[PDB]
Specification:
EC 3.5.4.-, binds N6-methyladenosine-5'-monophosphate, about 15% strand, alpha/beta, nine-stranded parallel β-sheet, A_deaminase_dom, Metal_Hydrolase
């Protein structure tokens, strides 16, 4: 069961860098910061331990994580570790998304934060990596706009993404607390990104919000994430616009955004032949792996090995990679296909 799924080549399209941290790394960072007196280690260890990861509590957890991880050398470390972890379960293509941070007291700009991410990619040595333009993994980057930001700070992220297209930035995400901010703040920056040929993925429908869901669909992003609280008119529009959905099974169940895997919309989308991609979202926060997500889907839908492999391969055309990378991915999958029957 889990062994063949672990061996399947897989494509990860929705993984937030600071949601993908090893527990042992987070606790080590906390210990060091406590020895310096920045935090009380026992309280921090407690929140990492006890936060029930309901939707409200998840964003409190991210505020704590960011207190532990926002410095250049830590960004470099966790970038390398996340790439290693995905490569070890035979992710062959990763779009890693992260919110560039500004931290004036340590001389960190959004640009230097992203330069520390690039340094993390350059530091990968346990696997072979392709990110510009023994397992091998292709990595491309999405820069996240957090819904707490302003239009002008969102525009700084978009401008930075355009400047970093040579080191594998391919797109922009809108994410962060779905209870905060207005679509009208971010639509103008996302439109600038889209008009400059960046690919766009939007977190959409994480909470009930009918006007915002319709407005995000009308923008015609290249992908959306989650789609938990769509109504029928939203599904009809989504299916007509053919926007792929990044499906986050464990996340949606843990946050109580979806009552159970057996009603999760990924099954309706699968049966309607609508593009979907199984994703981890935050494999550290939610204690999962991409192989575990596939295992949940495979059990729930009763997929054969051939159907599972076909679903995994279908994610290629939803990537934001250059066409040459997609051609390489088609070669990788077609070459592995006979082993998954
Ligand atoms: C539960 N599902 C989610 N919904 C909305 N936003 C999420 C998220 N999971 C992660 N993020 C976004 O990703 C950031 C952490 O990684 P980075 O600091 O960018 O690497 C969070 O602060 C949040 O804005």
């Amino acid at each position: 069961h889990m062994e063949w799924i672990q061996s399947l080549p897989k494509i990860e399209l929705h993984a937030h860098l600071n949601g993908s941290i090893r527990d042992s790394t987070l606790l080590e960072l906390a210990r060091v910061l406590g020895e310096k007196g920045v935090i009380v280690f026992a309280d921090v260890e407690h929140v990492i331990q006890k936060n029930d990861r309901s939707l409200v509590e998840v964003f409190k957890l991210f505020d704590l994580i960011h207190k532990l991880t926002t410095d250049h050398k830590t960004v470099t470390r966790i970038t390398r570790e996340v790439v290693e972890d995905f490569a070890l379960e035979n992710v062959v293509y990763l779009e890693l998304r992260t919110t560039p941070k500004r931290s004036d007291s340590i001389g960190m700009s959004k640009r230097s934060y992203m330069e520390a991410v690039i340094q993390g990619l350059r530091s990968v040595s346990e696997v072979d990596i392709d990110f510009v333009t023994r397992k091998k993994i292709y990595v491309r980057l999405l820069l996240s706009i957090d819904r707490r930001e302003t239009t002008e700070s969102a525009m700084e992220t978009v401008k930075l993404a355009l400047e970093m297209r040579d080191v594998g930035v391919v797109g922009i995400d809108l994410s962060g607390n779905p209870l905060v901010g207005e679509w009208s703040t971010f639509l103008p920056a996302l439109q600038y990104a889209k008009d400059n040929d960046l690919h766009i993925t939007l977190h959409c429908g994480e909470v009930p919000n009918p006007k915002e869901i319709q407005a995000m669909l009308d923008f015609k992003p290249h992908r959306i994430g989650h789609a938990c609280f769509f109504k029928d008119e939203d599904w009809t529009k989504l299916k007509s616009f053919r926007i792929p959905v990044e499906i986050c099974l464990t996340s949606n169940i843990v946050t109580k955004s979806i009552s159970s895997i057996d009603i999760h919309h990924f099954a309706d989308l699968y049966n309607a032949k609508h593009p979907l991609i199984l994703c981890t979202n935050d494999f550290g926060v939610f204690s999962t792996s991409l192989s575990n997500e596939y295992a949940l889907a495979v059990r729930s839908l009763g997929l054969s090995k051939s159907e599972t492999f076909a679903l995994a391969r279908a994610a290629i055309d939803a990537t934001f990679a250059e066409d040459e990378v997609k051609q390489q991915l088609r070669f990788i999958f077609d070459s592995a296909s006979p082993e998954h029957v």
